[PDB]
Amino acid sequence: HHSSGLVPRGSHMETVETAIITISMGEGISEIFKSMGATHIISGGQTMNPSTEDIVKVIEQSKCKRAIILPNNKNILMASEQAASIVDAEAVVIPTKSIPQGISALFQYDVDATLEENKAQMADSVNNVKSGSLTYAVRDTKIDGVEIKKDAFMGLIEDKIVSSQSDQLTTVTELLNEMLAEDSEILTVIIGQDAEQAVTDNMINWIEEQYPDVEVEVHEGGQPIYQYFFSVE
């Protein structure tokens, strides 16, 4: 859903030496991505995905010498790779396949690090960090062939539905029961606008009991739609 007239392509065009280009799915993630180091946000989930030439134009207009591209959607990986090949800039693609995966990869971005150091750390995150999210059904919906009734909570791992229940705590603890293992070391939790403090507190207490060795790192995100983003190292 967008407003009538010309739909913005993405964020304000800044001039930068190293462009950190992230695709949003049009659900209110831009603040978070900019906070984490993104320089250019491209709006995704329009009818047409961002094209090869859409990404080339962001890279060229930014006047960057180097770029890191996070498609955050498996459908946008080809356009990103094609763009990276075309441009004069030294451009690399971190092959993130979801918004939570993009968040996890941006934890590893360091503005002081070299392009190659950032590439290696962010690419490792896609392979070795488990990303997921908690949301809810604003209307009856189908994910992965599973029918979810309006108002149900939904636990997702890498955007696949794994749990759903009318009860939020039950949904999120089942989600985390699969995301966490006895050898997990760090769980990052990013709290959305609609999260309930009593759920968050009960969830943390559950983690501490069931997975007593995991470090729980909580941050405020303020995102709509997703009560939590989770990342397990």
Next chain:
Amino acid sequence: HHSSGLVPRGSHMETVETAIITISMGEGISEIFKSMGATHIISGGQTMNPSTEDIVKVIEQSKCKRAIILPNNKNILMASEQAASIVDAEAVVIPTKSIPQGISALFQYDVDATLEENKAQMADSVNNVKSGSLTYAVRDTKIDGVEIKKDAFMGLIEDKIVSSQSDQLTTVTELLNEMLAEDSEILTVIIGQDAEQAVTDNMINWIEEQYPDVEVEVHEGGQPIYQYFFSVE
């Protein structure tokens, strides 16, 4: 729950050259295990787990020359290893940690194979096959700290709760959504006494859509309590 008087220790004492010793959790699995090659079933989930000497006695009374022990419970692994060390027989432990894992390991047992060939294949199954089950809450219950209301269906992977819902199809398809991956090759389904044919048919149709490359191998089990056992190779 057992009947008054002396509670049976396990199945009929047979004399065999190679004993295949499996622990039941006292929920109606003996038929299935015997079908699959078990020679001796020890009853588990009494107050006290089977002891080292309980297992030694089964091995000694069977007059076996060789034995394979499947504890099917992490609490019984030490007794099994201690027994295997004590007996004259050449005894090996396959370190199964649940009943579904024991089932998966028994798929690999071949009465014509050597002890070492069976050991290797069955041990590989514990490491490389994903086992799980679908059940339901006969009363309000807590698994892994998660409260489940009476009548809810429950999806388990390696005995950890991952999904639960009043709707059976939703629960089992969410379970399978996590058990199956794009590169899964074979799903074995063992149908319990209480399974519903309409659920089974809808579940199979869902698998075929979402995971079109997986081979689905269905067998009748007839077990109580677990509508399905699942094994993913």
